[PDB]
């Protein structure tokens, strides 16, 4: 029926084939899972080669064949944009729900009764996790240092989680404003070689990657009067041109930012002016300085007016490791700032900046929402506990489908186990006996100290977000792949 | 005889293969066959991948090989142009219709007895169904919406099956004016990504997907005096084209809807005179437009007068999920309606988008056709119970393919119980003497619930034209091919 | 050696070749054979599929590779073009002659012998038919319409059997005059979907497929005077032409048929004078509008006087299922007609239009000659009656080939009845004994009742024509054939 | 009969009603009261088959090296 080439599944060999095809993935990123995993080398079939313990980023350089294959990429990506860490868990947790749905498939369970069960524990485990959560203070400056230093854990720059916490809390509550909404984007990670970790240092400003476009205009200005515009400078006629540097001069502004050109006839006339001007600035740094500034980015020259204008403490041109960049910095009240990444290596100030990425992300969601959940897998123990009684309920054949969704929960903490060389069962036998008798606040599993501790005493919480995004997530993407009994895969 | 590659098949061979061609197709769409069934994923030789539960879908993407094979294609497409829906039902029917024939064929029953029988069986199945149909109003707001939500189910819109009937059943009662004729054409069906399904609204007037061509115009005018006009406005020297546009000043109109474009100098006119315009309206849109209003569209704009002038209460452009967009809304009489989805995502009110038009369908189908009939299997029932009795007067081994004609029938209610994974044997047990003792309100198979219900009682029913089309369609299909004998296919 | 491809074939194998390369045709075709035979599916090397009943049409689509295959090819052709029906049935006749006379030729027996005996019990059952042949009326409208019905069965068109025969009775018996010589090519079969089969209508006129050649000309005219003019009216200078217009005028015509093209010029002329035109018209129709109207197609225009116009009561632009044609109708004395084919689909109106040809035929035959002879096999079985006692009186060996000849006649109620799922053997036992008992107007086997019935009563004949050429054509087929003992055959 | 479905319904029955109102009763085909139908059988036949299998599995799986002649 189809090309010589092209392939085709059905019935349990378009189940097993697509169950295999997740399943593999799910376990070349499971042993990358947890602080204690490793990491993957993989090079590209043009040379390029990406060392990094990333999932997301080892399933975008490798070349997947099957559909089930290229939809888990989709998935893996849509995490990227959503919360960019739990990746790994959400794939891992997906492929023990497919591993245990395929038995059901081969048992004579209809694809509508499997995926009823999930939906049904799933919907039940996201109520659980909203009820076992903790309301905490939004802008609490120590539940915020210790959600902030736990995300760190697991990465290069968990040897100055203490350092890193401190400027990336400071640097969310001073663009938050309101409790709340937080916005990521305020917040620019620079790095720049030179000094150590230690160093690393919130900027209240921006920290723009730009330069004098003159010789003849001053290094530096203080009381800074900022004009922004992305409009070049340029136009037909030095009349024209100069017309648009004299009303630059008439609304009173001594700093110029233009996101396009700025003609060696503008860069005169400013110099003459005594107006320093950095001209191609990226649009976002364009936006960040308005932020920090206050200035009203302009489009038409014409509209500038002083009105527009943006005020900066300071705004100084500094060589950095010797790169050259423009700092704007004391403005009255900035809604932007920059964190200058400091190391001894680009690639340990490279793997800072992943690191800080996600401590401003979760720092965000807390604030937001003012519940966060114990870690160390303690949630997990209170969901497995409950939807198993939870199955119960459900009787018939659907139940099987509900406790299997329960019992799968479990892979993630015993995977994490198995990297840190820890008792799968053991440390399930103390931590859940644990969780029963003293909560789920003096519970779950260290594998730092590789023992049961107490997660509240030791601040190692998350946000509720992440972990009832993974529940709706794992949950609607194992339930889709299981449906699928019949495929053509183009070769 | 044939060149080499070509193939031929005779007598018992072209008979085994014929019938394969069409059987391997009913086994491919039969296990998406009801609301508990599965959907399908085919990538085609391009990479263009469909992952859908539609039968003409599949068929229109896969590539067949076989007369047979192409020809059931044609068939399916001609199911989608009458109904849309019930193609997969009406192929599952004409292959088991086949699978018991070829048994006769292999017994020496002439093929012109075979298709005797079946032809006879047939015509008594549809005076059967035309005996055995209810009465109902042909306006009546509650069997509207029972029947309407009936249609929904199996699709991703019976979540809001409640909110989706209540405005397609008003849409038709709206448009279709006596009792009466509905046109599907009257009723647009838009989709807009934001909001959520409860969220979708019927829009008394149109909702066209055109801007305000100029900068200068009003974006939104009141007491509207629509003017439609096919005609492109533009014309040798700017005298001439002024004078198109002093035409429509002239006539009274404030909206002008081209079917073609309309050029800068008539936009400038326009705008002038305070008339608000958009340019490259689709041909339907116009049409549409034309109804909603009460306006007559024009080809000669000489021809336009004030009286070709049609009302609106509002005319208004608006961004809806950033998407700009007219609304031409609160005419005194609309003909024409918009139906605009919302939702989540995009898939969703695509989906959405297509259940609606089945919806429409149908409640167009109950007024046109004052006969329906219950669902769930019972009518097949009744056939099936009558047909029997049918083959005993007919006699001779004729009745050998009545009886079979009959029997085959039984083929949907048994592949929607397997899908439901429901006992085939014990719920026709317990329907059929139901049936025979309650009667046809008062039986059928409901695998919602996966036990005999009251499809009455349930608002569970369907247009008797849906039912009398399939015995047709499916019978001189069925037919047709028994004839054939002897095939020479090319490679 | 030969060539390397090319073949040879000598002796005994050159004969076993060629009667096989006919013997696989006559296979092919005699199960098409009869109303109760089936049809045929071929997909040529262009792609272009063919299903149909016909044998000539069927032969003519596939590819033969022997000469006799070839030269079979060309009889059914001949066979076409001379009779059109009839043609499985002359094919299947000489395949069962050549069957019986490759076993004389194994015998030893001459091929010219056989041929002897061939021509000889041919040359007897031509007089045979002759005497048994009984006279009737050349215009009875009885018969006529029983030979028309007679003619009908076995094609789509058997289910308004009546309807048909009445106008095509009426449509010949119009045009005949005398008694007569019929022309098929008087009467006109046109197709245009629409309305139903019983719709189909005789008109008393000529309906052609043109149109008015201006927007400016009327598009229906009274009283018509046709003129035809088979030159183009298209002259250098418009004085020139223009006179060419002034002499259609002065005749007194106001309908113009141009066999050729008609110049804007020409057409604005026309239009002025209230004359009607259509321009591009077929020879054929030309010719069928002087006979109709009476009017005398002219070549120079020069030549055509007021003494040269025909009459039409009517000539109307109508519409019909929207494709515009012209109606030249009510006529004084027609001797063409036309005859319009209703119908709910294009491929219906198609098969009657075939079955109308063979209609008008038939009704030809028995008015030009007026002996007919009894359908269901009557005539052969009189025929194998008497030639069995003249073998007798033939004697030696030339009586075998005289005997195999007789008995190789019985292969057509034999075939036609294991195609209707008849006792090959008893309906010869009981048609056969009441041909002795009763005669030849009281026999033969109804396939329509699975019996015995009585031919003249249910009408059930055929012209003596239409048997008498087959015993010529099938006789002299066979015996060239069994001469070939030497064949070489390019690849 | 259904594995799933009669465990489902006899355990839960056992839990609520207790050990002489519950049981499978395959002659039936549902769920039953043991003690009003009277199945029952004597304490010592499903003692002796705790003991026996248990001793006979505990054995066999403690062997870990066997040569077993042809």
Do not use: W
């Not at 990227?80 to 868990?89: H, I, P, Y």
């Not at 400003?205 to 290094?219: C, I, N, T, W």
């Amino acid at each position: 029926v189809l090309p010589e080439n092209m392939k085709r599944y059905m019935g349990r060999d378009a189940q097993r084939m697509n169950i295999l095809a997740g399943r593999i993935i799910a376990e070349t990123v499971r042993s990358t899972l947890g602080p204690k995993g490793m990491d993957k080398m993989l090079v590209d079939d043009l040379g390029d080669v990406v060392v990094t313990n990333d999932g997301v980023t080892i399933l975008r350089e490798m070349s997947v064949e099957h559909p089930a294959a290229k939809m888990l990429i989709e998935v893996a990506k849509t995490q990227e944009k959503e919360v960019g860490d739990g990746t790994t868990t959400a794939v891992v947790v997906a492929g023990e729900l497919l591993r245990k749905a395929e038995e059901l498939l081969d048992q004579n369970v209809h694809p509508t009764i499997v995926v009823k069960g999930y939906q049904a524990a799933a919907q039940k485990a996201q109520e659980l996790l909203k009820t076992i959560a903790c309301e905490v203070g939004a802008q609490d400056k120590e539940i915020l240092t210790k959600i902030a230093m736990t995300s760190i854990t697991g990465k290069g720059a968990e040897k100055a989680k203490e350092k890193l916490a401190e400027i990336i809390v400071e640097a969310v509550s001073a663009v938050v404003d309101d409790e709340g909404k937080v916005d990521k984007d305020l917040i620019k990670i620079e790095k720049k070689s030179g000094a150590s970790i230690d160093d690393t240092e919130l900027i209240k400003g921006v920290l723009v990657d730009k330069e004098r476009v003159s010789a003849q205009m001053p290094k530096k200005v203080t009381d800074a009067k900022i004009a922004l515009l992305n409009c070049a400078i340029e136009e037909t006629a030095s009349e024209m041109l100069k017309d648009m540097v004299a009303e630059i001069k008439a609304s009173g502004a001594n700093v110029l930012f233009c996101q396009k050109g700025i003609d060696d006839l503008a860069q005169h006339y400013l110099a003459k002016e005594g107006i320093v001007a950095a001209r191609r600035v990226k649009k976002s740094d364009m936006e960040k300085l308005a932020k920090a500034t206050g200035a009203n980015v302009i489009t038409n020259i014409k509209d500038l007016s002083a009105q527009d204008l943006g005020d900066a403490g300071l705004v100084e041109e500094r060589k950095i490791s010797g790169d050259s960049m423009i700092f704007v910095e004391e403005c009255k009240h900035p809604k932007a700032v920059t964190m200058l990444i400091r190391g001894t290596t680009e690639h340990v100030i490279e793997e800072v900046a992943r690191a800080v990425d996600a401590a401003v992300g979760v720092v965000g969601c807390t604030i937001e929402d003012g519940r966060i959940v114990s870690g160390g897998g303690s949630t997990e123990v209170e969901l497995s506990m409950k939807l198993r009684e939870y199955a119960e309920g459900i009787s018939g054949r659907e139940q099987l489908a509900v406790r299997a969704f329960a019992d799968a929960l479990e892979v993630i903490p015993r995977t994490l186990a198995e990297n840190a060389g820890l008792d799968a069962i053991e440390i399930l036998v103390k931590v859940r006996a644990a969780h029963a008798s003293n909560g789920n606040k003096c519970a779950g599993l260290n594998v730092f100290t590789g023992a049961v501790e107490d997660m509240c005493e030791n601040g190692v919480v998350e946000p509720l977000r992440v972990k009832t995004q993974a529940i709706q997530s794992a949950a609607e993407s194992t339930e889709m792949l299981l449906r699928i009994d019949d495929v053509i895969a183009a070769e």
